[PDB]
Amino acid sequence: MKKILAINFSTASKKGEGTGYAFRKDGQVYVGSIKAYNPKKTAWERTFDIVNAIKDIIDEFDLKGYHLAIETPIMGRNRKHSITLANCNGYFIGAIDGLVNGYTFIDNSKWCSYHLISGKREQRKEESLELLKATGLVDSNCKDDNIADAYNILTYCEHL
Amino acid sequence: MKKILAINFSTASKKGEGTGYAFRKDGQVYVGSIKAYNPKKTAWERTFDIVNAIKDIIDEFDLKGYHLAIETPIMGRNRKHSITLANCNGYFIGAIDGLVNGYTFIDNSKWCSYHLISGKREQRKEESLELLKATGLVDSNCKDDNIADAYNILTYCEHL
Numbered sequence: 001m002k003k004i005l006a007i008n009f010s011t012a013s014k015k016g017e018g019t020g021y022a023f024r025k026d027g028q029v030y031v032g033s034i035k036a037y038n039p040k041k042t043a044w045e046r047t048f049d050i051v052n053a054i055k056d057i058i059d060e061f062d063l064k065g066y067h068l069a070i071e072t073p074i075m076g077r078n079r080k081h082s083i084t085l086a087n088c089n090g091y092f093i094g095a096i097d098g099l100v101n102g103y104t105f106i107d108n109s110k111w112c113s114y115h116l117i118s119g120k121r122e123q124r125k126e127e128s129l130e131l132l133k134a135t136g137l138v139d140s141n142c143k144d145d146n147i148a149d150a151y152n153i154l155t156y157c158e159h160l
Numbered sequence: 161m162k163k164i165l166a167i168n169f170s171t172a173s174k175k176g177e178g179t180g181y182a183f184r185k186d187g188q189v190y191v192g193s194i195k196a197y198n199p200k201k202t203a204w205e206r207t208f209d210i211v212n213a214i215k216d217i218i219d220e221f222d223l224k225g226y227h228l229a230i231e232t233p234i235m236g237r238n239r240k241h242s243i244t245l246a247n248c249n250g251y252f253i254g255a256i257d258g259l260v261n262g263y264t265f266i267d268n269s270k271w272c273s274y275h276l277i278s279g280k281r282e283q284r285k286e287e288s289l290e291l292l293k294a295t296g297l298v299d300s301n302c303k304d305d306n307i308a309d310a311y312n313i314l315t316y317c318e319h320l
């Protein structure tokens with residue numbers, strides 16, 4: 001398969017949220033979340049920790065040379081947070097590029113289209129999570145859509 | 161003086177625009193611009209060129225362990241152009257953090273107010289240029305404000 005590290009990047013600004021990742025190593029899919037929440041750190045300081053956490057994973061599973069598929073950062077609710085998130089998303093890419101074999105921005109609409117995930121924001125979150133829960137890679141309780149999106153990005157990229 | 165590498169980052173989408181840089185190495189101030197303009201490329205590829213250009217400079221002048229002072233990205237013209245510039249700015253920082261000993265964002269308003277620079281964008285450019293031209297470091301007729309702004313960021317930082 002194409003060696004892909006899929007990332008759904010988040011600065012973990014709210015408790016319980018984090019950067020979603022997914023990759024395949026010898027047939028086996030690994031998924032998880034980097035839960036870097038800390039109210040005494042800025043978005044950029046928490047992004048530093050997320051980079052270090054993904055470098056640690058890249059080392060543990062020998063992922064050097066995997067291509068980075070990362071969800072496109074877009075304009076959110078408020079302007080200023082979206083620019084912050086855009087800058088932090090960039091920092092994250094720049095810090096691991098070279099360890100990874102370049103990167104591709106994956107628009108949310110494109111990976112949703114491939115999986116036939118259509119509907120409004122809430123509906124798409126549920127459907128993405130359903131697809132992840134159907135695989136058994138996480139507990140049936142799981143409500144972490146950051147992980148689900150990273151997993152659905154991976155499978156889309158493997159198809160391409 | 162702290163060993164500061166001052167950067168005024170731009171993707172050079174327009175002819176003549178460049179990423180400006182200024183630093184002090186063995187007591188001599190060096191200033192210049194990375195003229196990355198290339199209609200053949202996206203802002204991201206041009207950003208990658210700029211990273212590699214600054215990487216060459218850090219090597220040539222043995223600048224490892226210098227601290228990065230980089231102008232903050234602000235929300236300007238278009239929503240897309242804002243996310244794009246903010247994203248490429250973050251890429252540049254992430255790509256060179258480690259070669260540099262960390263970084264600090266320098267708001268346009270703070271270095272400008274330190275140097276008594278104010279007005280509309282065009283007015284600020286002329287005053288930024290006057291400070292650079294007054295040093296004698298560049299030719300008399302220099303109109304490269306990207307360079308002027310990086311130099312003024314350097315002296316603002318050195319002052320701290």
Ligand SMILES: [Mg+2]
Nearest residue numbers: 008009071149
């Ligand atoms: Mg996302």
Ligand SMILES: [Mg+2]
Nearest residue numbers: 168169231309
């Ligand atoms: Mg500037």
Ligand SMILES: [Mg+2]
Nearest residue numbers: 277278279283
């Ligand atoms: Mg005035």
